[PDB]
Amino acid sequence: TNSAGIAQQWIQSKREDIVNQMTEACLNQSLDALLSRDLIMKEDYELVSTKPTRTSKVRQLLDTTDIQGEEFAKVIVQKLKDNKQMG
Amino acid sequence: TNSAGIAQQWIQSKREDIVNQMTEACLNQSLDALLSRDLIMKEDYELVSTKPTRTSKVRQLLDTTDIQGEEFAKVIVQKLKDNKQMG
Amino acid sequence: TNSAGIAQQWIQSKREDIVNQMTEACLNQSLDALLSRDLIMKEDYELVSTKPTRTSKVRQLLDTTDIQGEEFAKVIVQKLKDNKQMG
Amino acid sequence: TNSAGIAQQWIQSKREDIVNQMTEACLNQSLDALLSRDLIMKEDYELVSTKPTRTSKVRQLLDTTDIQGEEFAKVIVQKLKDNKQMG
Amino acid sequence: TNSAGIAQQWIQSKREDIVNQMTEACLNQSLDALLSRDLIMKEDYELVSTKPTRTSKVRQLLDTTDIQGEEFAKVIVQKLKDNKQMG
Amino acid sequence: TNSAGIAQQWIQSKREDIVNQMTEACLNQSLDALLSRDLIMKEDYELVSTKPTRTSKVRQLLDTTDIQGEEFAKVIVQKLKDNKQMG
Amino acid sequence: TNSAGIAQQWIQSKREDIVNQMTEACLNQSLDALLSRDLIMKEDYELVSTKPTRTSKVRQLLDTTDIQGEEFAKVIVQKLKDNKQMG
Amino acid sequence: TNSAGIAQQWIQSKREDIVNQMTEACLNQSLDALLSRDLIMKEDYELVSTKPTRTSKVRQLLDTTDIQGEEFAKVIVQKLKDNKQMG
Amino acid sequence: TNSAGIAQQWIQSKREDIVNQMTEACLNQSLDALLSRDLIMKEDYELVSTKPTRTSKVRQLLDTTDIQGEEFAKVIVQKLKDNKQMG
Amino acid sequence: TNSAGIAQQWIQSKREDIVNQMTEACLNQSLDALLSRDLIMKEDYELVSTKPTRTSKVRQLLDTTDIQGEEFAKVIVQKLKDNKQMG
Amino acid sequence: TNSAGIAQQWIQSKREDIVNQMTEACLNQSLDALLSRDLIMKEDYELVSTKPTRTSKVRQLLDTTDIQGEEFAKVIVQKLKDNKQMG
Amino acid sequence: TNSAGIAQQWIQSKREDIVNQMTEACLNQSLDALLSRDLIMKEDYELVSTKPTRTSKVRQLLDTTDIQGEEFAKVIVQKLKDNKQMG
């Protein structure tokens, strides 16, 4: 609950960093594992994959991160730690 | 009348499948034959061709399918059967 | 139905592996047999063949894998087993 | 007027064929003669020349064919007849 | 006064043609020369440049054509004649 | 019509074989007879003749085989039979 | 103030020329020096770098030229003079 | 001004001929004298020198011919006359 | 004009024969007289003289035959008649 | 932190030089050591390795340099100093 | 698994050395044993064998080394040890 | 700086002459002294040494001359003066 909420909160706590740190591949592989574990429907997936710029593709994931809770978010947190990108 | 209505009804009966089964090319070739036989005006055609995602481009055709009746719809039914996509 | 759905699901179950395991030739020969048996229209084929990177060419096939069902997918599963690549 | 309208209408009458019959060179030489006789502005020319697939490059010309009338279209009709491609 | 009024009236006299004849580049270059000579404020310019379809972008200019009089309109008339598009 | 379509279809039916069976000379002599009978424009001919690998030069012909119909394809079928290569 | 305003005004005074005179390299080097001196944020930079045509990439810079004032614009004026392109 | 404009216009007047008449050496020597007199930046030069076919390398110069005016074009006109190729 | 065009057309009319009939010496002496009368630049000459096989050296001349018109071609026609090879 | 930031800032401070000074081998060896120490994912690596021109391949690395921080950048700074290229 | 992964990792650990140490014959014999044991398809084999420089032919193998895992890589490790080249 | 820049500029000032005046031995000895003093990496050296024609081998050096500055260029200027070739 708490650290579950903190997980997406930490995303929201450092969201400016995710605009900086997350690449397209850091995005698109993270788009993959969500679509792999089916944490996102494809209609929402097409929304992120059609935005023109990186930051436009970033924010659509990160807005969808908030509405989908912790398990959607924890893997993205795990993505940046499995990257060891440490942003 | 009846099967004429059923034709667009069958579209509405399996609309979730058309979100699944219809591609962009299954869309855009179907956009072609409607524009070929002039079953759609170009103002409505530009509406479908400008939506950002596939499903956004799907639903705009499928909403326009209902208001335009059977002959607009029967060719789209014929499109999926001329595809032999069988969705 | 079920294993038919599981076939493209197994693709979606291990999609990160297909980003890893599938080469260009593992891609392009798989593009061939689909185009050989006419499981893909050429407009969708040109979409995959024009993407700049391997992973960009990978994802376009794999997105088209989901919308086209089992027979489109089963041969790609058969491709990796006829490769005996075992990914 | 009439056959002038029929000229671009015949294009719209068989547009699926132009997706089939017209190549890249059948496209790009037709792009040339329009740009030769200045029937197209270069901003519209860059739109066609930047689309990724053939069919994407096809449709942009063919959409621009309708808005530009007969003289823009008659040479394209003459192109397919000077090709003797007879599509 | 009169031909000044007729200039935007001729636009209104053949407005259906401007939905047909005017392209995006015929639009956007005409958007340029108005913004070049500062016949439009940028807030009104952003209104036209954000509409999703061509016809949506067409009508916003053409509605703004009526409220801004002759000098705003005469250059657009001159645009179609400098195009020699003759619509 | 039918066997005319089957002729290029048989090419598409066994396209993996044409990646295997067709050599460079089996390619380039087939490029000759098409250019001899003027079934290909030289702009499309330069596209095939500039690809770096055999298979890259193979696929460009075989993609151009589909868009150009039967008479373009029947001689290539006749080429493999005049070769008596029997692939 | 005045010549500061005139600097971006001169850009707006001859904007049709910048559609003509500015190349991609005249664009992209000008995109560089702005990003070098950090006169543009990268989110706005990705907007220009993703537009499909030259003129689409031109106008996005030139629209961003107006909202960012003189120092953003003076270097672009200096760019065309350091080019000695004299447009 | 006029004959200055006519110089690049004559290029555009007979552009189909330049697709025909200009060789690679007629291209690449013309690429040299532009790069000799520094009428082209090297970023634009690399764009022409990387296109796969002759016509692809032709059109990139000829598109860059229009945006760069007369002095960029007059030497290319002088190139074909110093060639005495008379196309 | 006509027989001037027919001269290189007759080359294109029987190009398969030139793959057959023309030797290396029938090639290289024909390369000489073109270089003697300066109908070819040396950069294009080095292109033909570096291809590995006869047919590779044949096609490079014969492709250069089309872009260089009649006087470049008429001597090659005269070469085969001064040979009295009669191909 | 500071000199860590300055390291990628110095890259951004002299980015026009990196368009000049960095070769393909200065690029591709620098692409190697990043891929050697795994400072880049291969999806981002394929993006740089597929761009057509040097400068297109340059900017994709240099854009990826900013989003990946100091350790990604410090080795590239070390690359130019281990080159002793001193740009 | 681990030393299996380390085997291709050791390749990636010292990849700069493989640019140095591996010759053409150290390459091409290694290309042989992979093609002998059928660890590579011929389409991927033609990709390596067509690159112009040694390092271009090196990197294409070494990129294909990563996507094909351990057994593809272990023999290449065994190749350098059967060479006793000890790089 | 200035004469340092002029040194490679003089190369660019008379580049058509270097296409004329420089032989293969004037090339390859100049390739030697650069490789002797290690002004070129071997990956760039293999690029020049693999081009098929002299002019193809010429331009690759001369393009690499511009990106590598003065000391790379001054010895090539010294090469033509130590030749006393005086081109």
- Could you please report the per-residue DSSP string of K3-20? HHHHHHHHHHHT-HHHHH
K33-39: Cβ within 8 A, 24+ apart: K33/K75, K33/K79, K34/K72, K34/K75, K34/K76, K37/K75, K39/K68, K39/K71, K39/K72, K39/K75
CA distance J80 to chain K (A): 16
CA distance C5 to C12: 10
Cβ C8 vs Cβ C69: under 8 Å: yes
CB pairs under 8 A between F and K: 12
Please, which chains are in contact with G (at least 3 CB pairs closer than 8 A)? Answer: A, D, E, H, J
Technique used? cryo-EM
CB contact under 8 A, D38 and H12: yes
Which amino acid makes up residue K28? N
Give the residue from chain F lying closest to K41, CA to CA: F20
Q: Which residues contact A30 (CB under 8 A, 6 or more apart)?
A: A22, A61, A75, A76, A79
In J, which residues are within 8 Å of H53 by CB distance?
A: none
C38 and F14: CB-CB below 8 Å?
A: no
Pairwise CA distance, residues L78 & L26, whole Å:
12
Q: Three-state SS for H84?
A: coil
Report the amino acid identity of residue D34: L
Query: How many contacts does A have with J, using Cβ atoms within 8 A?
Result: 21
- Residue in chain G closest to H43 (alpha carbons) equals G25
CA distance to partner chain B, nearest, from residue A36 (Å) = 17
Residue recorded with tokens 């018109």 = I69
| Residues 6+ positions from L31 with CB-CB distance below 8 Å | L40, L45, L48, L49, L61
Chains that touch D (3 or more CB pairs under 8 A): B, C, E, F, G, H
Q: Are F60 and F18 in contact (CB under 8 A)?
A: no
CB contact under 8 A, D16 and B36: yes
- Inter-residue contact K2 to K26 (CB < 8 Å): no
Q: Where are the alpha helices (DSSP H) in J1-87?
A: 2-13, 16-21, 24-36, 42-49, 54-67, 71-82
Both tokens assigned to G62: 């030139």
Handedness of CA I14, H18, G51, D63 (dihedral sign): negative
Return the SS3 of E22: coil
Q: List all residues 6 or more positions away from K51 whose beta carbon is below 8 Å from its beta carbon.
A: K57, K60
Chains D and G touch (3+ CB pairs under 8 A): yes
Question: Taking a C-beta distance cutoff of 8 angstroms, is the pair E54, E27 a contact?
Answer: yes
How far, in Å, are A81, D83, E35, J26, J38 from residue J33 at the CA level?
22, 53, 50, 11, 8
**The token pair that represents A31 in the structure block:** 């788009």
> Would the CB atoms of K16 and J32 count as touching at under 8 Å?
yes
Closest CA–CA distance from residue J46 to any residue of chain A (Å): 10
Q: Which value in Å is the resolution of this experimental model?
A: 4.1
Whole-angstrom distance, CA of residue J70 vs CA of residue J76: 10
> Do chains F and A touch by CB distance (3+ pairs < 8 Å)?
no
The residue type of C76 is I
**For F14, phi and psi rounded to 5 degrees?**
-125, 80
Nearest CA in chain F to D24: F44
Q: Give I42's contacts in chain L (Cβ within 8 Å).
A: 55
**Residues from chain L contacting residue J26 (CB–CB below 8 Å):** 41
Pairwise CA distance, residues F35 & D37, whole Å: 29
User: In D, which residues are within 8 Å of F41 by CB distance?
Assistant: 23, 25-26, 29
- Enumerate the residues of chain E whose CB falls inside 8 A of the CB of residue B50: 52-53
CA distances from B73 to B6, B8, B64, F28 (A): 10, 6, 9, 48
* Domain map (residue ranges) of chain L: 2-82
Residue J66: list chain G partners with CB under 8 A: 42
Closest residue on chain C to B54 (Cα): C67
Whether F42 and I66 lie within 8 Å, measured CB to CB: yes
Residue H80, CB half-sphere, CA atoms under 13 Å: how many? 19
- Distance from the Cα of H36 to chain D's closest Cα (Å) equals 28
Query: What separation in angstroms does the CA of G64 have from each of C17, G76, J63?
Result: 42, 12, 20
What interhelical angle do L24-36 and L54-67 show, nearest 10?
40
Query: Which of B27, B34, B35 would best serve as a mutation to test chain D binding (most D beta carbons within 10 A)?
Result: B35
Do at least 3 CB pairs under 8 Å connect K with B?
no
CA-based nearest residue in chain A for residue G51: A52
Report CA-CA distances (Å) from B74 to B28, B45, F47.
16, 18, 41
Give the C window 38-77 contacts with D, CB below 8 Å: 42-43, 46-47, 50-51
How far is A60 from A70, CA to CA, in rounded Å?
Answer: 17
Q: Which residue in the set K15, K55, K59 is minimally distant from J36, CB to CB? A: K15
D36 and H13 within 8 Å at the Cβ level: the answer is yes
Question: How many interchain CB pairs under 8 A, D with E?
Answer: 21
Contacts of K55 in chain L (CB under 8 A): 42-43, 46
Chain J residues with CB under 8 Å of K15 CB are 32, 35-36
Instruction: Return the residue of J nearest to H52 by Cα.
Output: J52
Q: Which residue does chain C place closest to A45, by CA atoms?
A: C63
Residue type, I48: V
CA dihedral C5, C10, C12, C13 (to 10 degrees): 130
Residue of J nearest to G31 (CA): J16
Residue type, A87: G
**Are J43 and C55 inside 8 Å of each other by CB?**
yes
DSSP H helical ranges for chain C: 2-13, 16-21, 24-36, 42-49, 54-67, 71-82
What is the three-state SS of A18-40? HHHHCCHHHHHHHHHHHHHCCCC
| Chain D nearest C-alpha distance from C51 (Å) | 8
Q: How far apart are CA D77 and CA C13, in angstroms?
A: 50
Backbone angles phi, psi at E37, to 5 degrees: -85, 5
Q: Could you tell me the CATH superfamily of domain H2-82?
A: Death Domain, Fas (1.10.533.10)
Distances (CA, A) of D47 to B25, B27, D31, D65, H65: 20, 21, 11, 13, 18
Query: Residue H1: exposed, middle, or buried by beta-carbon count in 10 A (0-12, 13-18, 19+)?
Result: exposed
Subunits touching I (CB < 8 Å, at least 3 pairs)?
Answer: F, H, L
